[PDB]
Design a protein around this ligand. Structure first.
Ligand SMILES: [Zn+2]
Length: 29
């Protein structure tokens, strides 16, 4: 529900710091 790294079952309260986190899930490529 809401926004949150769809890759890992975590929880966040924003889209900025939340996006930067998912940025490490797709290193390069
Ligand atoms: Zn994640």
């Amino acid at each position: 529900k809401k926004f949150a790294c769809p890759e890992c079952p975590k929880r966040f309260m924003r889209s900025d710091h939340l996006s930067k986190h998912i940025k490490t899930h797709q290193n390069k490529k």
